[PDB]
């Protein structure tokens, strides 16, 4: 195959409590080797591998480069976060909720899959009930699944045995929902 | 290591000698806000919300990518031309929404652990190459500095059609196929 030489620059802003606690880490990467970075908690560029000292020392010796980078914590991280607050952080997409068994015969173990799909943001609460009892064991959940289109999905599975005439419900709470969604599955 | 309520990349910047080619995108909490079409000098936002209320100067990306090109040539010299290592991508296929026959849906092909960031992702329907109804993300960054990429196939679930996601990458000996069908 053809040889490839790869360079990455990643400027990353970490936010907590709005813009009150912010950390900026800029990372300089050759192929997959991060060789220099700026960390606002450190306040100067640092070499991280032997490839880095000529870069870090140069940028630290250029006071306007150094000073501009320090200022980016405010002029980029916090600045752009204000723009996220108007859009991204107000995006609300309601989940669709579906139940299906994983074939179903009465006294035989089965898995009930509550599919919770196409929601944003990521915070969600999904609870299984058997009649009026909340199921706190036998629940197996996928990790949060990132669809790449600014929605998530998650599958929450209940290990159970269909008996007559049990009724199962999946209860979904999400910041997009004024009231929880309740979907039910009835044995036979 | 870094605990935060939110994480942004206000520059995922990429330049590579193969092509050569580059990418400039912003990410917020792991999703791609936009990439800049570097040839057309156009910012391409990834949601209608973003297209109507946000603006980003494409020259910023062009300038940054020019710096990476400069930096890359310095580090090639300093490393005696140490080339990128080909990694083995991991592929998963799943549906966007619960499947019911006759109800339009979307298949999702996640191609993870991509390095270097050069890949072909295509779809097969009953063994036939799919030419329409396919879209994909840019390369999305990962904290180990590989990438992932996601491809989308619009489809109509039926009892007679099955799907494969087909992935070509230098880290693979042959094209990798990931199969999916309505059960």
């Amino acid at each position: 195959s053809p040889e490839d030489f790869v360079y990455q620059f990643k400027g990353m802003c970490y936010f907590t409590n709005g813009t009150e606690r912010v950390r900026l880490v800029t990372r300089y990467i050759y192929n997959r080797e991060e060789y220099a970075r700026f960390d606002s908690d450190v306040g100067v560029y640092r070499a991280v591998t032997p490839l880095g000292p000529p870069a870090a020392e140069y940028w630290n010796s250029q006071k306007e480069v150094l000073e501009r980078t320090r200022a980016e914590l405010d002029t980029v991280c916090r600045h752009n976060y204000q723009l996220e607050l108007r859009t991204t952080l107000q995006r609300r997409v309601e989940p669709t909720v579906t139940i299906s068994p994983s074939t179903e015969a009465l006294n035989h173990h089965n898995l009930l899959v509550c599919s919770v799909t196409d929601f944003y943001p990521a915070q969600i609460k999904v609870r299984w009930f058997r009649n009026d009892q909340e199921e706190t064991t036998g629940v197996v959940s996928t990790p949060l699944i990132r669809n790449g289109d600014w929605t998530f999905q998650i599958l929450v599975m209940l290990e159970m045995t269909p008996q007559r005439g049990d009724v199962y419900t999946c209860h979904v709470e999400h910041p997009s929902l004024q009231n929880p969604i309740i979907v039910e599955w009835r044995a036979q | 290591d870094i605990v935060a309520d939110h994480v942004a990349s206000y520059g995922v910047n990429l330049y590579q000698s193969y092509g050569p080619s580059g990418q400039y995108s912003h990410e917020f909490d792991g999703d791609e806000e936009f990439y800049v079409d570097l040839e057309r000098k156009e910012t391409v936002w990834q949601l209608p919300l973003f297209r109507r209320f946000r603006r980003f100067d494409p020259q910023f990306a062009l300038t940054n990518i020019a710096v990476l090109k400069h930096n890359l040539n310095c580090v090639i010299k300093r490393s005696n031309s140490t080339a990128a290592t080909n990694e083995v991508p991991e592929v998963t296929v799943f549906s966007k929404s619960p499947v019911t026959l006759g109800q339009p849906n979307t298949l999702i092909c996640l191609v993870d652990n991509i390095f270097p960031p050069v890949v072909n992702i295509t779809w097969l329907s009953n063994g036939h190459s799919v030419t329409e109804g396919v879209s994909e993300t840019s390369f999305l960054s990962k904290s180990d500095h590989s990438f992932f990429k996601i491809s989308y196939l619009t489809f109509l679930p039926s009892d007679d059609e099955i799907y494969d996601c087909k992935v070509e990458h230098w880290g693979l000996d042959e094209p990798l196929l990931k199969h999916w069908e309505p059960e």
Binding site: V76, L83 | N13
Partner: peptide, 15 residues
């Protein structure tokens, strides 16, 4: 208000 971005530091090396 326009989005801003983090400027990539430029290496100083012989061309």
């Amino acid at each position: 208000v326009e989005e801003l971005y983090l400027v990539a530091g430029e290496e100083g090396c012989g061309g």
